[PDB]
């Protein structure tokens, strides 16, 4: 009840503004959080669409959030706290309160960059820095024995200084911890980012995150293409069983593509660690002009 009390933010300190995004598993809203100093802080608010999905009490949700509040790394989003809102049937509904990242998610940013009004055309070297940024965040998380489990460009956020941070921890957990959700919440995992072994069995390790990182690198290199053009979601497991993998994007350095495809080796033990990936990418980025 020290870190558990500390993580909770009083609901009255929060004013909800507009909905920024709404999906099957929750919504993101703008909000304002009244400070101790009398000032207001702009925040994002993530709601969860919980309808009998959990097999633990809300304390469990809070203790996981408390652990994540301790994350301290430029490439990992740091949550501010959690607010609880009671349903009419007396069920607590948690709200994760995050600092507001003005540029939004990396995926959408990449797409906007392909329009005249958007961000300017993103140079190869900046694309590569995005990938290093994500590698550093995942290295930090994997060093703390966290499994991300929803690693995609849409769940990476852009800070005011164009630093990417890893976000959307809704499915994240410590290796060896129990499930918070029942069988219903793997449905949030997008199929085209799921490692072959995790499609075969309810099995997910840090090497499954490495696979998803390689898919994320590919999304970045293609400036936001959906993985596996021409392949439907329900075909993916067979496609991968036959040894097919993401194709090399146009203008992608051969070196970079080698790094990506090391992430999709059939045996998880043949995939690199995030430390190795990160160093390979830093080296590659260093080897190029300014
Ligand atoms: C199994 N355990 C059970 C218990 N769980 C507890 C728990 C569950 C979830 C989280 C958690 C942590 C971080 C996030 C943030 O994720 C972002 C990526 C995706 C959405 C979302 N977006 C924004 O947050 C955002 C959007 C915008 C913006 C700008 N422009 N536009 C259009 C939007 C501006 N700033 C932002 N910060 C969500 C949930 C933490 C703890 C653990 C697991
Ligand atoms: Cl409100
Ligand atoms: Cl942060
Ligand atoms: Cl978002
Ligand atoms: Cl596209
Ligand atoms: Cl492909
Ligand atoms: Cl190819």
What would you note in describing this structure?
The protein has 290 residues and is an alpha+beta fold. The chain contains nine helices and nine strands. It has helices at residues 3-7, 58-69, 106-112, 124-142, 196-200, 206-221, 236-241, 254-262, 274-286, and strands at 14-23, 26-34, 40-48, 81-86, 92-99, 146-147, 156-158, 164-166, 173-174. A five-stranded antiparallel sheet has the order 1-2-3-5-4, with helices on one face. Helix 4 packs antiparallel against helix 6. The chain binds ligand R6K and chloride ion (6 copies). Residues 15-16 line the site of one chloride ion (CL). It is found in: Cell membrane. Residues 14-285 form the Protein kinase domain.
Radius of gyration: 19 Å
Instruction: Name the shape in a single word.
Output: globular
- CATH homologous superfamily annotation of the largest domain: Transferase(Phosphotransferase) domain 1
How many helix segments?
A: 9
Number of strands: 9
End-to-end Cα distance: 51 Å
CATH topology of the largest domain: Transferase(Phosphotransferase), domain 1
Overall structural class, as computed from helix and strand content, comes to alpha+beta
- CATH-defined architecture of the largest domain: Orthogonal Bundle
Largest sheet: 5 strands, antiparallel
Total domain units: 2
H/E order of the elements? HEEEHEEHHEEEEHHHHH
Fraction of residues in helix:
25-40%
As laid out across the biggest beta sheet, the strand order is 1-2-3-5-4
Q: What CATH first level of the largest domain would be assigned?
A: Mainly Alpha
């Amino acid at each position: 009840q020290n870190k558990l009390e500390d993580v909770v933010i009083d609901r009255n300190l929060l004013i909800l503004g507009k909905i920024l995004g709404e999906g099957e598993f929750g919504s993101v809203m703008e909000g304002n959080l009244k400070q101790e100093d009398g000032t207001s802080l702009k925040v994002a608010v993530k709601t969860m669409k919980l309808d009998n999905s959990s097999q633990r009490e809300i304390e469990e949700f809070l203790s996981e959030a408390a652990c994540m509040k301790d994350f301290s790394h430029p490439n990992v989003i740091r949550l501010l706290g959690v607010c609880i809102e009671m349903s009419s049937q007396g069920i607590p509904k948690p709200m994760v309160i995050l600092p507001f990242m003005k540029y939004g998610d990396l995926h959408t940013y990449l797409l906007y960059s392909r329009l005249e009004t958007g961000p300017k055309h993103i140079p190869l070297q900046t694309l590569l820095k995005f990938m290093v940024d994500i590698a550093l965040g995942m290295e930090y998380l994997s060093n703390r024995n966290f499994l991300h489990r929803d690693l995609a460009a849409r769940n990476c956020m852009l800070r005011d200084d164009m630093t990417v941070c890893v976000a959307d921890f809704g499915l994240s957990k410590k290796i060896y911890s129990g499930d918070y959700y029942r069988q219903g919440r793997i449905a949030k995992m997008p199929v085209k980012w799921i490692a072959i072994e995790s499609l075969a069995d309810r099995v997910y390790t840090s090497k499954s995150d490495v696979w998803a990182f390689g898919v994320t690198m590919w999304e970045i290199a293609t400036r936001g293409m959906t993985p596996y053009p021409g392949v439907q979601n329900h075909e993916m497991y067979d496609y991968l069983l036959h040894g097919h993998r993401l194709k090399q994007p146009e203008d992608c350095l051969d070196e970079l593509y080698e790094i990506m495809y090391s992430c999709w080796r059939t045996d998880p033990l043949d995939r690199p660690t995030f430390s190795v990936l990160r160093l390979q990418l830093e080296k590659l980025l260093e080897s190029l002009p300014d």
